[PDB]
């Protein structure tokens, strides 16, 4: 768990990320600081909480027993639960906290697309491509 | 129970000038059960099932995903090859399947396990070669 400071809805400003901010994410609008007289003079107000809940399965049981590893074991994480910047990034997305904020406390692939046939990727780049 | 599974198809057609699919026999391995001879008897007589429907689901239990049907109408046994070894504790056979028709329907799933939507079909009469 980590918090991150609010912005204050009277006054943060609507922005458009550039190529490196949506990459760790048509128009997509982020939201900034800025600074005003409830915003006192900071860019937030109050905080909220950012999560990333790690659930001990009967896979997880293994990899603990047999000693897997960090690496191992976090690969293996990551296929199930969510990361703690992702939750983060969720709520940038709805406008709660800041990519400032979030951030702070924070063998060759190969791929196929035949017209316009989707597959089943989960690269960010080759999206729903074989 | 099935143990493995093969089955294919190829185009005749080419871009480089149309040509016609050639739809396989579904082969298929198993364990020698209560089922053989009945299996032998209809490759023997050459009596076709009305139906035959092979089922894959994900690792986990009976509640898990069925992600892939394969339907099968109008169904011959067109092979069955079986025997054994002195090492095997429970022998194993293949099963080779001719059909008229054939459909088949796979399930995708999103991250957590859950279906992604409806199933994607596929179907397509072999005997008079159109679409089903």
Same mark, same amino acid.
């Given at each position: 768990?980590?918090?991150?400071?609010?912005?204050?809805?009277?006054?943060?400003?609507?922005?458009?990320?550039?190529?490196?901010?949506?990459?760790?994410?048509?128009?997509?609008?982020?939201?900034?600081?800025?600074?005003?007289?409830?915003?006192?003079? #900071?860019?937030?107000? $109050?905080? +909220?909480?950012?999560? =990333?809940?790690?659930? !001990?399965?009967?896979?997880?049981?293994?990899?603990?027993?047999?000693?897997?590893?960090?690496?191992?074991?976090?690969?293996?994480?990551?296929?199930?639960?969510?990361?703690?910047?992702?939750?983060?990034?969720? #709520?940038?997305?709805? $406008?709660? +906290?800041?990519?400032? =904020?979030?951030?702070? !406390?924070?063998?060759?692939?190969?791929?196929?697309?035949?017209?316009?046939?989707?597959?089943?990727?989960?690269?960010?780049?080759?999206?729903?491509?074989? | 129970?099935?143990?493995?599974?093969?089955?294919?198809?190829?185009?005749?057609?080419?871009?480089?000038?149309?040509?016609?699919?050639?739809?396989?026999?579904?082969?298929?391995?198993?364990?020698?059960?209560?089922?053989?001879?009945?299996?032998?008897?209809?490759?023997?007589?050459?009596?076709?099932?009305?139906?035959?429907?092979?089922?894959?689901?994900?690792?986990?239990?009976?509640?898990?995903?069925?992600?892939?049907?394969?339907?099968?109408?109008?169904?011959?046994?067109?092979?069955?090859?079986?025997?054994?070894?002195?090492?095997?504790?429970?022998?194993?056979?293949?099963?080779?399947?001719?059909?008229?028709?054939?459909?088949?329907?796979?399930?995708?799933?999103?991250?957590?396990?859950?279906?992604?939507?409806?199933?994607?079909?596929?179907?397509?009469?072999?005997?008079?070669?159109?679409?089903?």
């Amino acid at each position: 768990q980590r918090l991150v400071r609010t912005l204050c809805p009277d006054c943060k400003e609507p922005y458009e990320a550039d190529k490196e901010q949506r990459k760790l994410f048509e128009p997509l609008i982020l939201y900034r600081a800025t600074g005003c007289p409830k915003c006192n003079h #900071k860019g937030y107000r $109050g905080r +909220t909480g950012i999560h =990333e809940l790690l659930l !001990v399965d009967d896979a997880l049981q293994e990899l603990i027993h047999s000693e897997a590893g960090e690496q191992a074991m976090e690969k293996h994480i990551r296929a199930t639960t969510p990361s703690i910047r992702d939750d983060g990034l969720d #709520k940038v997305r709805q $406008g709660i +906290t800041s990519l400032e =904020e979030v951030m702070r !406390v924070t063998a060759v692939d190969m791929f196929i697309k035949i017209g316009d046939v989707k597959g089943e990727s989960k690269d960010k780049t080759h999206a729903e491509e074989i | 129970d099935v143990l493995a599974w093969s089955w294919g198809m190829s185009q005749s057609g080419s871009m480089h000038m149309a040509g016609k699919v050639n739809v396989q026999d579904l082969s298929f391995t198993k364990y020698i059960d209560k089922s053989t001879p009945n299996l032998m008897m209809a490759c023997s007589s050459g009596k076709h099932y009305p139906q035959a429907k092979l089922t894959i689901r994900k690792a986990g239990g009976e509640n898990q995903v069925e992600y892939l049907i394969i339907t099968l109408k109008e169904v011959l046994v067109s092979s069955v090859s079986t025997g054994g070894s002195g090492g095997e504790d429970r022998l194993t056979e293949n099963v080779t399947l001719n059909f008229a028709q054939v459909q088949v329907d796979y399930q995708p799933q999103k991250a957590d396990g859950a279906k992604d939507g409806g199933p994607v079909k596929y179907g397509w009469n072999i005997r008079q070669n159109v679409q089903a």
